[PDB]
């Protein structure tokens, strides 16, 4: 029945660990505030602050524009949720029997329609705040990482990493806390109807991933229109340094790192956290924990997260205080040791939590039957997910870091042109999918066998128990991107840019690694949500060999490709506008190409703003309308196949897009760095080889930064949407099969 750790204990521990998380985050922002600068060498400090202000102004300006739209959609959609969910029992206010225990009476479905809408609003608002806070810290840390670079890599590393850790700890504690609050608040109303309490809390992950979808796509098109434009004309055509202040797209480019790579990624990861936690919660609510009203075991996923924070705080110190970087070859293994330490520390942490938060025996809902599960079996569920991440990390690294042969052979293929560079890169990413799929598959088999959907939901959360650390090394990247962006823009020494370029390359690998973690955990959470949807829809069997299910499967597998076609073409078209505008300024503003005259940055901000804001609508629509269109016309059996098909298919293309993109970026950085005979013999910057790498890198730009990373939101989003609307689809769905 009960576990060692009493209910009230859990009620204290959880928000305590959140608060500690926010305290840590603020203490770090404080230490970062020690690096001083203003716009009132002395000049080089002033030039940094004026550039940093351009970016900060530019990124706050876009997010307000984007969130204004997204926020309107969020309201429209909350109405739908209410209407559709309320329409099931014809908006009755009368209680009915608990579908999980006919002897008992539950709160009316109308209530759950209402609280669903509230938890959705919470989830979406929290997702937006995650993006916004992430940008605010990144637009603050960027130039301070520039100034500290004067003292060498190791000092710049610290302000970039301390800052990344600001975002990670803020995001993780805030999401943990909101969920915690929402639960207790709702419980005031639901009392003993824990089934309906947690059914309403599922809106939270729906809100999270909904807003994230637009955040990622909008911020993604914005930033990559800029990037591909600046780089092509600036580097391939006009033969000037990357991020040169003469280049009119340079401000949009660096703003982009903050509205895409940081704000978009911030929200994306919030959704991953929200859904996984919520998937664990719903399965539990109709399992022995929820049925016996055992709060501690019921909140087991929240306790794992609480301990994850503490664990991640301790891990952070190893990079923050117990180790100084002195050479550039030490930067990555620092970042990589962050992963290894937290994984190892969390394993202990999780065994402890498994030991004191669970009863040694209990039951997990398994498609209508209470399965007998043991607490050590549950430990292995979260542990197999946790370690699957680390594996994915190691392998992604091997495939995206220019310290290894795969990428160096990609760089080396530039010797015969761009075409070979592109062929090697594509082949690289395809190859990269293999071990992660295997890690995902193993992870699924173990956790599925032990505790059905709950095991899988808990595996996903295992993969994100170290989410604070994971976020820091991820947010470290774009900060190091801006930092060398400001260095070049402020005409600082070549020795500064050399350091930032080592940081930036390190952030390239961790960018792909975090992408791997998002794909992996999104496959786990999707599979949990899918299987939960099936029960909720009163489906008896998802049988691949029925006509309804199979058409669902093959069409669902096509969706990720449809989505990719849209996002790619969007960037490809906006980048074409950027290139024309950049050329126009170079060819018609006298004095520009010789640094005597100033470029018009605002036009490039205006081109990327107009395209991202407009073009984030159709792919947002495909993802959000699909569950609804399919659920209503074809019904829940066809929807089942669609959920399965987009998972097994989306995952393949997300992984290879992100890795191919990463491999091209770092292949380029390798040539740029000339830190070996081989690398030098490919250089120098401007050579035919370097220009092949730049082409490859720019094709990879929208792959790894718009399509690739958003595809994991597609997969995990369609599953919560389906699970949430399942009562409506079960009852009013499959019209086409009814009219005929």
x/- letters, 544..563, toward a copy of itself (CB under 8 A)? xx-x-xxx-xxxxxx-xxx-
Q: Which of K ion, a copy of itself, Mg ion, none does 392 bind, CB closer than 5 to 8 A by kind?
A: none
User: Residue 149: which of 485, 507, 509 has the closest Cα?
Assistant: 485
3-state secondary structure at position 614: helix
Q: Is residue 199 at the binding interface for Mg ion, with CB under 5 A as the rule?
A: no
How would DSSP label each residue in 173-221?
HHHHHHHHHHHHHHHHHHTT-HHHHHHHHTHHHHHHHHHHHHHHHHHHH
The answer to whether residues 630 and 396 touch, using CB atoms and an 8 Å cutoff, is no
Does residue 507 touch K ion according to CB under 5 A? yes
Residues 255-274 binding Mg ion (CB under 5 A) are: 257
Position among 66, 193, 199, 227 found at the interface with Mg ion (CB under 5 A): 227
Who's near 717: CB < 8 A, 6+ residues apart? Answer: 206, 209, 210, 213, 271, 623, 624
**569 touches a copy of itself (CB under 8 A):** yes
Q: Is 589 in the site for a copy of itself (CB under 8 A)?
A: no
In the complex, the smallest distance separating the C-beta of residue 484 from Mg ion, rounded to whole angstroms, is 6
Stretch 644-663 residues interacting with a copy of itself (CB under 8 A)? 644-645, 647-649, 651-653, 656
Residues 210-229 that bind a copy of itself (CB under 8 A): 228
Q: Which does 721 bind (CB under 5 to 8 A by kind): a copy of itself, Mg ion, K ion, none?
A: none
Residue 257's binding partner out of Mg ion, a copy of itself, K ion, none, with CB under 5 to 8 Å set by partner kind: Mg ion
CA 241-246-248 angle, 5° bins: 110
Longest dimension (CA), the chain: 83
Q: Of 116, 135, 170, whose CA–CA distance to 55 is shortest?
A: 135
Q: Which of 508, 510, 585, 609 is the binder for Mg ion (CB under 5 A)?
A: 508
Q: Does 416 bind a copy of itself (CB under 8 A)?
A: yes
232 binds a copy of itself (CB under 8 A): yes
Q: Which does 572 bind (CB under 5 to 8 A by kind): Mg ion, K ion, a copy of itself, none?
A: a copy of itself
Q: Is 420 helix (H, G, I), strand (E, B) or coil?
A: helix
H-run or E-run covering 629: helix 617-633
Q: Which is nearer to a copy of itself, 233 or 263 (CB)?
A: 233
Instruction: Give ∠ CA 553-557-558 in degrees, rounded to 5.
Output: 125
Query: Which residue number, 434 or 629, has a Cβ lying nearer to a copy of itself?
Result: 434
User: Which of a copy of itself, Mg ion, K ion, none lies near 534, with the C-beta cut-off 5 to 8 A by kind?
Assistant: a copy of itself
The reply, when asked if residue 508 is annotated as ligand binding, is yes
Which listed residue (327, 434, 621, 629) binds a copy of itself by CB under 8 A? 434
Residue among 571, 592, 630, 636 that touches a copy of itself (CB under 8 A): 571
Q: Radius of gyration (Cα) for the chain, nearest Å?
A: 25
Q: How far is CA 160 from the centre of its chain?
A: 19
Q: Is 420 among the residues that bind a copy of itself (CB under 8 A)?
A: yes
Nearest to 719 by CA among 120, 205, 176: 205
Q: Is residue 508 at the binding interface for K ion, with CB under 5 A as the rule?
A: yes
Q: Is 321 within any annotated ligand binding site?
A: no
CA distances from 605 to 233, 252, 254, 495, 582 (A): 16, 5, 10, 29, 12
3-state secondary structure (DSSP) of residue 288: helix
Q: 513 vs 695, which CB is nearer to a copy of itself?
A: 695
665 annotated ligand binder: yes
Dihedral angle, C-alpha 447, 452, 457, 462, nearest 10 °: -20
Choose among a copy of itself, K ion, Mg ion, none what residue 227 binds, the Cβ cut-off being 5 to 8 Å by kind.
Mg ion
Please list every residue from 71 through 90 that binds a copy of itself, using CB under 8 A: none
- Going by C-beta distance under 8 Å and a sequence separation of 6 or more, which residues neighbour residue 73? 210, 214, 620
List binders of K ion among 455-484 (CB under 5 A): 477, 481
| Residue 700 lies near K ion (rule: CB under 5 A) | no
SS (H, E, C) 482-514: HHHHHHHHCCCCHHHHHHHHHHHHHHHHHHHHH
Judged by CB under 5 A, the stretch of 48-56, 369-377, 500-508, 713-721 that binds K ion is: 500-508
Nearest-approach distance from CB 318 to Mg ion, in angstroms = 24
Rounded CA separation 342/345 (Å): 5
- CB contact at 8 A, 312 and 372: no
Out of 430, 633, 687, 732, point to the residue binding a copy of itself (CB under 8 A): 430
Residue 672 contacts Mg ion per CB under 5 A = no
Of 347 and 508, which CB lies nearer to Mg ion in the complex structure?
Answer: 508
Whether 701 has a binding-site annotation, put simply, is: yes
For the CB of residue 356, give the shortest distance to K ion in the complex, in Å.
Answer: 39
**SS (HEC) of 31-77:** HHHCCCCCCCCCHHHHHHHHHHHHHHHHHHHHHHHHHHHHHHHHHHH
- Residue 7 annotated as binding? no
Q: How many CA atoms lie within 13 A of 242 on its CB side?
A: 26
Does 474 bind Mg ion (CB under 5 A)? Our answer is no
Q: In the complex with Mg ion, which residue's Cβ is closer, 114 or 675?
A: 675
With respect to Mg ion, which residue has the nearer C-beta, 307 or 575?
575
Say if residue 169 is preceded by a cis peptide, omega within 30 of 0.
Answer: no
Contact 399, 508 (CB under 8 A): no
**Looking at beta carbons only, is 481 or 721 nearer to Mg ion?**
481
Q: Is 543 annotated as a binding residue?
A: no
Closest listed residue to residue 647, CA positions, set 533, 517, 538, 519: 519
> Which residue number, 314 or 423, has a Cβ lying nearer to a copy of itself?
423
Q: Is 367 in the site for a copy of itself (CB under 8 A)?
A: yes
Candidates 231, 268, 275, 501: give the one binding Mg ion (CB under 5 A): 231
Q: Residue 617, interface with a copy of itself (CB under 8 A)?
A: no
For residue 280, the minimal CB distance to a copy of itself (Å) is 18
Q: Does 454 contact a copy of itself by CB under 8 A?
A: no
Nearer to Mg ion among residue 137 and residue 644 (C-beta): 137
Please enumerate, by residue number, every residue annotated as part of a binding site for substrate. Answer: 224, 704
Please enumerate, by residue number, every residue annotated as part of a binding site for Mg(2+). Answer: 227, 231, 257, 481, 508, 665, 701
Q: List interacting residues with K ion (CB under 5 A).
A: 477, 481, 507-508, 511
Please enumerate, by residue number, every residue annotated as part of a binding site. Answer: 224, 227, 231, 257, 481, 508, 665, 701, 704
């Amino acid at each position: 029945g009960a576990a060692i750790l009493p209910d009230l204990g859990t009620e204290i521990l959880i928000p305590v660990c959140a608060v500690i998380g926010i305290a840590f985050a603020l203490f770090q922002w404080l230490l970062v505030s020690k690096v001083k600068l203003s716009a009132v060498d002395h000049n080089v400090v002033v030039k940094c602050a004026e550039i940093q202000n351009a970016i900060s102004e530019g990124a706050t300006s876009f997010l307000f524009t984007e969130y204004k739209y997204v926020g309107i959609f969020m309201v429209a959609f909350a109405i739908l949720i209410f209407l559709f969910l309320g329409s099931v029992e014809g908006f009755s206010t009368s209680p009915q029997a608990c579908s999980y225990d006919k002897t008992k009476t539950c709160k009316p479905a109308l209530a759950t329609a209402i609280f669903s809408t509230v938890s959705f609003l919470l989830g979406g608002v929290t997702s937006l705040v995650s993006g916004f806070l992430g940008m605010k810290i990144a637009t603050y840390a960027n130039a301070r990482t520039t100034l500290e670079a004067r003292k060498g890599v190791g000092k710049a590393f610290i302000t970039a990493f301390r800052s990344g850790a600001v975002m990670g700890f803020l995001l993780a504690a805030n999401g943990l806390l909101v969920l915690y609050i929402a639960i207790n608040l709702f419980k005031i109303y639901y009392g003993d109807d824990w089934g309906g309490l947690f059914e309403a809390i599922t809106g939270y992950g729906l809100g999270g991933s909904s807003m994230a979808l637009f955040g990622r796509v909008g911020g993604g098109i914005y930033t990559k229109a800029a990037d591909v434009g600046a780089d092509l004309v600036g580097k391939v055509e006009r033969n000037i340094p990357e991020d040169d202040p003469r280049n009119p797209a340079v401000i949009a480019d660096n703003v982009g790192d903050n509205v895409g790579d940081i704000a978009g990624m911030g929200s994306d990861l919030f959704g991953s956290y929200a859904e996984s936690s919520c998937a664990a919660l719903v399965v539990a609510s109709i399992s022995s924990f929820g049925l016996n009203h055992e709060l501690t075991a019921m909140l087991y996923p929240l306790i794992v997260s609480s301990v994850g924070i503490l664990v991640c705080l301790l891990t952070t110190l190893f990079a923050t205080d117990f180790f100084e970087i002195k050479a550039v070859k030490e930067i990555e293994p620092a970042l990589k040791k962050q992963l290894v330490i937290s994984t190892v520390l969390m394993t202990i942490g999780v065994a402890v939590v498994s030991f004191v938060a669970l009863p040694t025996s209990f039951t997990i809902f398994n498609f209508g039957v209470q399965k007998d599960v043991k607490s050590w079996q549950l430990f292995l569920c979260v542990a197999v997910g946790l370690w699957a991440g680390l594996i994915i990390g190691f392998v992604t690294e091997y495939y995206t870091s220019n310290a290894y042969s795969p990428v160096q052979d990609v760089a080396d293929s530039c010797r015969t042109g761009a075409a070979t560079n592109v062929i090697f890169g594509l082949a690289l990413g395809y190859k990269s999918v293999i071990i992660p799929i295997f890690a995902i598959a193993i992870s699924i088999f173990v956790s599925f066998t032990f505790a059905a959907m709950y095991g899988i939901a808990v595996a996903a959360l295992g993969m994100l128990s170290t989410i604070a650390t994971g976020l820091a090394i991820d947010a470290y990247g774009p900060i190091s991107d801006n930092a060398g962006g400001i260095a070049e823009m402020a005409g600082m020494s070549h020795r500064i840019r050399e350091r930032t370029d080592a940081l930036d390359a390190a952030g390239n690998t961790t960018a792909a690694i975090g992408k791997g973690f998002a794909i992996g955990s999104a496959a786990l959470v999707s599979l949990a949500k899918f299987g939960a949807f099936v029960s909720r829809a009163s489906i008896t069997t998802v049988d691949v060999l029925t006509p309804k299910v199979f058409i669902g499967l093959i069409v669902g597998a096509m969706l990720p490709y449809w989505f990719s076609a849209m996002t790619m073409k969007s960037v490809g078209s906006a980048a074409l506008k950027m290139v024309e505008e950049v050329r126009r300024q170079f060819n018609t503003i006298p004095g520009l190409m010789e640094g005597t005259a100033k470029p018009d940055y605002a036009t490039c901000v205006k081109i990327s703003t107009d395209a991202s804001i407009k073009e984030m609508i159709p792919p947002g629509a495909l993802v959000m309308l699909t569950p609804l269109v399919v659920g209503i016309l074809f019904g829940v059996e066809t929807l089942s196949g669609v959920l399965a098909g987009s998972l097994v298919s989306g995952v393949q293309i997300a992984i290879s897009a992100s890795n191919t993109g990463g491999a091209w970026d770092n292949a380029k950085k390798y040539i740029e760095a000339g830190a070996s005979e081989h690398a030098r013999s490919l250089g120098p910057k401007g050579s035919d080889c370097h220009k092949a790498a730049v082409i490859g890198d720019t094709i990879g730009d929208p792959l790894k930064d718009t399509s690739g990373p958003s595809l994991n939101i597609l997969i995990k989003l369609m599953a919560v949407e389906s699970l949430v609307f399942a009562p409506f689809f079960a009852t009013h769905g499959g019209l086409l099969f009814k009219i005929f």
